[PDB]
Amino acid sequence: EGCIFCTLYRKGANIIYETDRLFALIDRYPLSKGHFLVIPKAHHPYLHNYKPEELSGVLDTIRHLVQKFGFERYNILQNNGNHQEVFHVHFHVIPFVSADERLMINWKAKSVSDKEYSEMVEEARLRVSS
Amino acid sequence: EGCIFCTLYRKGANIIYETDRLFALIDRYPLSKGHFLVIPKAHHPYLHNYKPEELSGVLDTIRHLVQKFGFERYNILQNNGNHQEVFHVHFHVIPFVSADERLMINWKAKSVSDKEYSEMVEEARLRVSS
Ligand SMILES: [Zn+2]
Numbered sequence: 001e002g003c004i005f006c007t008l009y010r011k012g013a014n015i016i017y018e019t020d021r022l023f024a025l026i027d028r029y030p031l032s033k034g035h036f037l038v039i040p041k042a043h044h045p046y047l048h049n050y051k052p053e054e055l056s057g058v059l060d061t062i063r064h065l066v067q068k069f070g071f072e073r074y075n076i077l078q079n080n081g082n083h084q085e086v087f088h089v090h091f092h093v094i095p096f097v098s099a100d101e102r103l104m105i106n107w108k109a110k111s112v113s114d115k116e117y118s119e120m121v122e123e124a125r126l127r128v129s130s
Numbered sequence: 131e132g133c134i135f136c137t138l139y140r141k142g143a144n145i146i147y148e149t150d151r152l153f154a155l156i157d158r159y160p161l162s163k164g165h166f167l168v169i170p171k172a173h174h175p176y177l178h179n180y181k182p183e184e185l186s187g188v189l190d191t192i193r194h195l196v197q198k199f200g201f202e203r204y205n206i207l208q209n210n211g212n213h214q215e216v217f218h219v220h221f222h223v224i225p226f227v228s229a230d231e232r233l234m235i236n237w238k239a240k241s242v243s244d245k246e247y248s249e250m251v252e253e254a255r256l257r258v259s260s
């Protein structure tokens with residue numbers, strides 16, 4: 001077998017929208033009605049593997065499609081090496097339909113000392129500055 | 131009270147990175163070590179409320195920061211009216227640290243008839259074409 005998204009673009013069937021750099025598909029296994037995908041034509045496993053040229057216009061295309069589809073409530077999700085099934089970057093756009101039909105996150109947030117946060121901020125500045 | 135992200139940008143403290151249109155903060159209540167936020171300076175509740183000018187460079191800035199931070203495994207998440215606490219668009223970048231320290235999604239996917247999928251694709255084409 002080879003990459004499903006490269007294969008689907010090559011086959012050229014069921015593509016709902018296309019730009020110079022991107023194409024869109026309705027998800028065959030949706031979390032919610034209207035769940036679609038915005039996908040760069042170029043193939044790399046992770047977002048940081050792309051040059052800017054290969055990723056041109058993702059958020060614009062998402063905006064364009066949610067407007068055409070009439071979606072007001074939705075989540076954008078992109079997965080790098082966590083919950084990633086397919087190793088070709090793709091952006092999920094997942095409409096909120098109802099409580100049992102939507103993106104479902106278990107948001108277990110940790111709290112930090114102010115000083116653990118001051119440290120975290122300083123460390124981030126060090127990384128940015130390197 | 132008024133918008134936390136507008137307030138935090140105005141106060142100008144703890145900003146880790148900035149571009150003409152965006153700024154970044156380390157999340158004060160992280161899902162995982164290094165969880166940060168890329169935030170447009172301009173204020174609207176939802177992604178589709180922004181013009182392209184106000185959203186310029188989000189994915190580039192995310193790429194830039196994950197590279198500076200050395201993150202290889204991470205999720206990008208943006209919430210419009212589902213699991214949204216703050217009504218000013220912000221992109222979560224959430225590193226995968228371990229199984230109990232990462233973005234946790236309950237991925238309950240539905241299956242469809244080929245013909246329910248052919249219908250879904252046709253309906254999407256109709257919406258795009260309108
Ligand atoms: Zn591919």
Ligand SMILES: [Zn+2]
Pocket residue numbers: 133134135136137172173174217218
């Ligand atoms: Zn704001």
